[PDB]
Amino acid sequence: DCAKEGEVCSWGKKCCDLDNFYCPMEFIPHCKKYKPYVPVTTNCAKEGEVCGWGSKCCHGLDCPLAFIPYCEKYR
Amino acid sequence: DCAKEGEVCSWGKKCCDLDNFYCPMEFIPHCKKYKPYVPVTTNCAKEGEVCGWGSKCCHGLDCPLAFIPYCEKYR
Amino acid sequence: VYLVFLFGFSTAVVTLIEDGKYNSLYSTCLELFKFTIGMGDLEFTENYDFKAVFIILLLAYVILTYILLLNMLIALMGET
Amino acid sequence: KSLFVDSYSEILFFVQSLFMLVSVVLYFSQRKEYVASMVFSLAMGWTNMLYYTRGFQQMGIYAVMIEKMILRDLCRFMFVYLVFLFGFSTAVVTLIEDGKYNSLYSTCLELFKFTIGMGDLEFTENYDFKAVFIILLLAYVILTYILLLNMLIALMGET
Amino acid sequence: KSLFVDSYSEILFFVQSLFMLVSVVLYFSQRKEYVASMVFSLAMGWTNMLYYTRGFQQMGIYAVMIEKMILRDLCRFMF
Ligand SMILES: CCCCCCCCCCCCC(=O)O[C@@H](COC(=O)CCC)COP(=O)(O)O[C@H]1[C@H](O)[C@@H](O)[C@@H](O)[C@@H](O)[C@@H]1O
Ligand SMILES: CCCCCCCCCCCCC(=O)O[C@@H](COC(=O)CCC)COP(=O)(O)O[C@H]1[C@H](O)[C@@H](O)[C@@H](O)[C@@H](O)[C@@H]1O
Ligand SMILES: CCCCCCCCCCC(=O)O[C@H](COC(=O)CCCCC)COP(=O)(O)OCCN
Ligand SMILES: CCCCCCCCCCC(=O)O[C@H](COC(=O)CCCCC)COP(=O)(O)OCCN
Ligand SMILES: CCCCCCCCCCC(=O)O[C@H](COC(=O)CCCCC)COP(=O)(O)OCCN
Ligand SMILES: CCCCCCCCCCC(=O)O[C@H](COC(=O)CCCCC)COP(=O)(O)OCCN
Ligand code: NA
């Protein structure tokens, strides 16, 4: 049998319906449901603004690897 | 700028048409053409026969990890 | 001494290849630092223009860095 | 003879200058390879800075220890290590004639990666002589770590 | 007992020759496994070159140290 939502997993039982549920890494994990992929809303860093230091880049942008990185478009 | 087939690559020039050619790992590599994926012909190990000791499994089978493995169907 | 070696080889690598994860000193410094902690990358899958010169630089860097670590370990035995 | 056992810094600075001159010659000859020489003069240019560790006592003693370690023990280690590496590389190329072990250079690099903890023991490919390859790789790894251990211990008797 | 605790090199060279002869026998018996035997002989053929470190004092002492480290302490670790 399987562990249902809210039941303890990995101590003899795995979670069922893995397309919707997962067993976290918590030493007494309980089966939890996935969340929808909500795109990045406001309060993000726009193109040309500093990222990494308290603000992440918006949905269409990426933050390079630098001491003071700035958001830039994908590719 | 680019190297053609039979020309020296990686010493200042990359080879063009990388969908059909590649630069080997030879310390003075010359650009070479890819080869077609010919399936496994006879002189292969069939299901239930010993693989690894001088004969590979035929294209429809896989060789497990063991001291004396035997060919088996894919998972 | 370690930082001297790291900066020297980082500048050489960035000059030789100025693109694809080696376009800045910060990224190249981190990538070379990874070799010191056993997390390196010697796959050489990218099609660089100066491959087989990049390989020689990386091998020399790794050998010198491990010589330095060995020398440190030996020198610290003179206190016991 | 004295250059072989003394006055190394003059040789290293001279080699740096030679690389610079070759870079100039290639630059004015309409070649792209002048970069390849230039970086070799650049990297050496930084390591030669350790020459100036003399004039400070602690760094001078440290640099002298580095020099003598390299010139005494690492040579004896590297001779034996290279013999073992070449032998097993030839064995592996002979056993497996294709698929990342089709050349001696590639096999030498792949076996060298084990010495620095970046090896590959997945055994995913469908080789003809699998399960003989595994024995060779295990033996190579064990012997290489014996050699490294012996080097480390040999450097403790000198302290 | 003196066969094994002394004169290891004779045993190693003899085992190399045994691998070569088994390779020949498999070769003329129409078997593909001879390659396996051959490669083992080849591998031993290189490591046995360490025998010639005698006649040079520093390399000879280094090789003696390797010998005793293998034959004394590693066998306790591996168990
Ligand atoms: C990209 C690839 C880079 C490779 C570079 C490799 C590390 C460079 C390190 C540079 C350090 C410069 C230096 O300081 O050179 C070192 C040499 O280090 C080496 O072993 C280099 C191996 C070749 C000391 O040599 P020194 O000129 O001091 O000669 C000593 C006499 O002065 C003294 O009177 C005594 O007679 C004594 O016996 C002599 O030794
Ligand atoms: C594919 C897989 C390969 C496996 C290869 C494994 C390592 C090869 C190492 C090759 C070294 C060859 C050699 O030269 O062998 C060495 C011994 O190292 C070993 O073999 C270790 C085997 C464990 C010298 O042994 P030796 O014949 O000199 O006998 C000594 C006397 O002479 C002396 O007077 C004393 O009585 C002393 O106690 C004796 O020992
Ligand atoms: C040197 C090698 C060690 C590497 C791994 C160390 C991990 C330690 C975990 C610390 C911790 O903080 O562990 C907490 C308690 O768990 C335990 O560990 C119990 C034992 C505690 C006794 C030490 C959190 O676990 P939890 O309460 O189940 O989380 C659910 C709530 N969401
Ligand atoms: C011990 C192991 C170390 C591993 C990592 C070392 C990284 C060093 C960075 C070198 C560098 O050269 O880093 C540049 C200089 O800045 C600094 O980092 C200052 C701090 C220097 C003091 C160390 C990065 O500056 P940047 O503005 O982000 O460059 C983007 C261009 N617009
Ligand atoms: C230090 C590095 C070790 C890494 C490799 C680990 C080897 C242990 C194998 C244990 C075993 O139990 O391996 C079995 C015995 O073989 C031998 O190994 C013979 C030598 C035994 C003397 C050591 C093989 O059985 P099998 O092929 O899986 O049988 C199919 C049915 N399943
Ligand atoms: C310590 C670091 C260990 C890892 C790397 C070791 C690689 C060594 C190569 C061994 C070899 O056997 O590589 C040969 C050439 O190696 C040389 O560069 C010779 C220079 C003289 C010094 C050896 C193969 O010759 P090739 O022309 O490259 O083959 C292509 C023709 N099809
Ligand atoms: Na590692």
Side-chain angles (χ1 to χ4, degrees):
Chain A
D1 206 349
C2 279
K4 304 296 185 296
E5 185 174 358
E7 296 183 357
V8 175
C9 49
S10 307
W11 288 94
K13 296 188 291 184
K14 60 176 80 69
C15 309
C16 255
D17 190 12
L18 296 171
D19 297 330
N20 296 312
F21 300 92
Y22 66 98
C23 186
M25 180 70 76
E26 300 180 356
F27 180 84
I28 308 181
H30 299 78
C31 306
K32 293 183 181 180
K33 188 176 180 181
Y34 290 115
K35 303 294 185 178
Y37 180 76
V38 177
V40 177
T41 191
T42 187
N43 307 315
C44 58
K46 298 181 179 180
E47 186 172 1
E49 296 182 338
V50 173
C51 52
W53 293 88
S55 179
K56 60 182 182 180
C57 295
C58 302
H59 180 73
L61 302 174
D62 190 2
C63 192
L65 182 63
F67 192 71
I68 306 294
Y70 298 84
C71 298
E72 60 183 10
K73 62 175 187 63
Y74 287 116
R75 302 177 176 180
Chain B
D1 292 322
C2 260
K4 298 180 181 180
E5 187 175 13
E7 295 182 356
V8 176
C9 54
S10 299
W11 285 93
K13 296 170 70 176
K14 62 175 79 67
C15 200
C16 262
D17 193 2
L18 295 171
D19 295 333
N20 296 276
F21 302 90
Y22 66 99
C23 184
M25 179 67 73
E26 294 176 1
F27 179 81
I28 307 179
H30 296 81
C31 189
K32 296 184 181 179
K33 190 175 179 180
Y34 290 117
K35 302 292 185 181
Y37 178 75
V38 176
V40 178
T41 191
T42 187
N43 306 313
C44 58
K46 298 181 179 179
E47 189 174 8
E49 295 182 339
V50 174
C51 54
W53 292 88
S55 179
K56 60 174 80 70
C57 295
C58 312
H59 69 283
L61 303 169
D62 188 1
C63 190
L65 183 63
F67 191 70
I68 306 293
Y70 297 78
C71 299
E72 60 184 7
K73 293 189 285 291
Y74 293 102
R75 183 172 177 181
Chain C
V1 177
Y2 174 76
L3 291 173
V4 165
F5 275 94
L6 177 62
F7 184 81
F9 276 91
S10 168
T11 53
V13 168
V14 171
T15 300
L16 187 64
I17 304 167
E18 327 202 79
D19 219 308
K21 309 185 287 181
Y22 301 109
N23 60 342
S24 62
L25 290 173
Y26 191 78
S27 180
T28 306
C29 277
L30 287 169
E31 291 291 332
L32 292 179
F33 173 74
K34 283 178 190 172
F35 281 87
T36 305
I37 58 174
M39 301 173 59
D41 189 3
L42 296 168
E43 299 293 317
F44 301 104
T45 57
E46 293 81 345
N47 295 309
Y48 295 127
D49 294 311
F50 286 107
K51 188 185 287 184
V53 179
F54 183 56
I55 294 161
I56 294 163
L57 289 174
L58 282 176
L59 291 171
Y61 170 80
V62 170
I63 294 163
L64 293 169
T65 301
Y66 286 11
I67 290 165
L68 289 171
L69 286 168
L70 180 62
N71 188 73
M72 181 186 67
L73 249 299
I74 297 300
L76 264 66
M77 300 296 181
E79 308 302 302
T80 61
Chain D
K1 187 175 177 182
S2 59
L3 296 171
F4 193 84
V5 304
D6 196 313
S7 302
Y8 299 108
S9 52
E10 306 291 336
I11 296 164
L12 295 170
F13 276 83
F14 192 68
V15 169
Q16 182 191 346
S17 65
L18 290 173
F19 276 116
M20 181 61 84
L21 296 176
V22 174
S23 294
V24 172
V25 170
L26 289 170
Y27 178 83
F28 283 109
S29 297
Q30 306 183 22
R31 307 297 300 182
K32 291 185 182 180
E33 294 86 47
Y34 86 100
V35 176
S37 297
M38 182 177 68
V39 298
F40 286 127
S41 65
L42 185 55
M44 291 185 72
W46 286 103
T47 63
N48 284 341
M49 195 166 286
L50 290 181
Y51 167 84
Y52 296 94
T53 53
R54 68 193 68 187
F56 313 91
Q57 185 170 357
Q58 299 82 10
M59 302 300 298
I61 300 299
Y62 186 62
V64 168
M65 284 192 294
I66 290 166
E67 179 232 320
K68 293 300 188 187
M69 184 170 288
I70 289 168
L71 292 173
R72 286 180 184 170
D73 294 301
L74 187 62
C75 296
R76 287 199 300 273
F77 172 76
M78 288 299 296
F79 180 82
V80 176
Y81 175 76
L82 289 176
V83 167
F84 275 47
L85 177 62
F86 182 81
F88 275 89
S89 301
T90 53
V92 168
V93 172
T94 301
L95 187 65
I96 296 166
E97 295 262 76
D98 201 346
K100 303 168 60 175
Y101 308 101
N102 60 344
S103 64
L104 193 54
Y105 182 81
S106 180
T107 305
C108 276
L109 291 171
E110 290 292 331
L111 288 177
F112 174 76
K113 285 179 192 170
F114 280 91
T115 303
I116 58 173
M118 299 171 59
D120 187 15
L121 297 170
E122 300 293 310
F123 302 103
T124 62
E125 300 295 333
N126 185 30
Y127 295 126
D128 292 304
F129 284 103
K130 188 174 177 179
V132 180
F133 185 54
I134 295 162
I135 295 160
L136 287 172
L137 282 179
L138 293 170
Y140 170 80
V141 169
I142 292 164
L143 293 171
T144 300
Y145 284 15
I146 290 166
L147 286 174
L148 287 167
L149 182 64
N150 188 73
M151 181 188 67
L152 251 295
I153 297 298
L155 290 177
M156 302 301 163
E158 143 279 303
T159 55
Chain E
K1 184 178 175 181
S2 64
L3 173 58
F4 295 95
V5 306
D6 195 322
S7 304
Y8 291 91
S9 57
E10 306 288 335
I11 295 165
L12 296 171
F13 277 79
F14 191 68
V15 169
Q16 182 193 346
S17 66
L18 292 176
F19 277 118
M20 181 63 89
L21 298 174
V22 173
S23 173
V24 172
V25 169
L26 288 171
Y27 178 82
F28 282 108
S29 298
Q30 303 183 26
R31 301 300 306 181
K32 291 173 68 177
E33 288 78 341
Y34 82 97
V35 172
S37 297
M38 181 175 66
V39 295
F40 282 106
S41 179
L42 183 57
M44 293 185 73
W46 284 106
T47 61
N48 285 338
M49 196 163 283
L50 200 69
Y51 170 85
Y52 294 95
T53 52
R54 67 195 69 184
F56 312 94
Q57 183 173 333
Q58 299 83 13
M59 299 299 298
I61 294 162
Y62 185 71
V64 168
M65 288 191 179
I66 291 167
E67 157 188 342
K68 300 305 185 203
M69 185 169 287
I70 289 171
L71 290 169
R72 288 180 181 177
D73 295 318
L74 183 62
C75 290
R76 289 190 296 167
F77 174 80
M78 289 301 301
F79 173 81

